[PDB]
Amino acid sequence: SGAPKLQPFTFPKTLHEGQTVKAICTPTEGERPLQFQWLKDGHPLRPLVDIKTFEDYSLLKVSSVGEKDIGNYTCIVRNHHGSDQFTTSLTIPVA
Amino acid sequence: ASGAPKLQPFTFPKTLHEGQTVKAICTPTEGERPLQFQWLKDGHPLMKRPLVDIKTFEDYSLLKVSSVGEKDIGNYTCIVRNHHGSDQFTTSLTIPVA
């Protein structure tokens, strides 16, 4: 008990070029404090991409989404007990 | 209709368990401020409760339901409005059988 478990999240498939898109990384259980780490295609993460982290959730914001942003994004959440993680694909229709 | 708000679609995870925390984010993909956000449950304005918490950011909203119970099962709607238009989504908070 005490280790984090993340709320499942996937990017919607109806996002369109130029829109702002966000991913939320947040536990459904787990002791605090919590550490949040974001990766894109396996590597750590540009003015148009922002990370805002709070006590028990972290928000990745990709503004004016475009070809430069397509890829797989991972959030790893950690506390003193262990970690959880999810990965979700950001793809957009051909405008 | 330039300036009108549009929401990022959001759906609760389909398999929730009693006791967990669950959150819904209501965040705009486009639009001009000022924006106003509201939440409904089963079509009625969402009432404040000790473990039902609406967080207000500068231009988005977050609903946090702690210790999910059968009390919380229902259909939740977020509506965003401004001078130029409105948008909304609805998602069901469900506890399916184990």
Numbering used by the authors:
A (entry chain B): 0 to 44, 47 to 96
B (entry chain A): -1 to 96
What did the study's authors say about this model?
Recently, a shortened Dscam (sDscam) gene family with tandemly arrayed 5′ cassettes in Chelicerata species has been identified, which encodes ∼50–100 isoforms. Chelicerata sDscams could be classified into two subfamilies, sDscamα and sDscamβ, containing one and two variable Ig domains, respectively. Crystal structures and cell aggregation assays demonstrated that both α and β subfamilies of sDscam used Ig1 for the isoform-specific trans recognition in a hand-in-hand manner. Furthermore, the cis interactions were established by the three FNIII domains of sDscam, which assemble into a cross fold with a kink between FNIII2 and FNIII3.
We also determined the crystal structures of sDscam Ig1 from another chelicerate species Limulus polyphemus (isoforms α7 and β3v7) to provide insights into the conservation of sDscam trans recognition within Chelicerata. These crystal structures of Ig fragments were determined at 1.3–3.1 Å resolutions. The crystal structures of sDscam Ig1 from both M. martensii and L. polyphemus revealed a common assembly of antiparallel homodimer for both α and β subfamilies of sDscam. In addition, all these Ig1 homodimers resemble each other well with root mean square deviation (RMSD) values of 1.0–1.6 Å, indicating a shared mechanism of sDscam trans recognition within Chelicerata. Similarly, sDscam Ig1 also employs the ABED face to form an antiparallel homodimer. However, among the seven Ig1 structures reported here, the complementary electrostatic potential surface pattern (negative in one end, neutral in the middle, and positive in the other end) has been only observed in the three β isoforms, but not in any one of the four α isoforms. Electrostatic and shape complementarity had been observed in all Ig1 dimer interfaces.
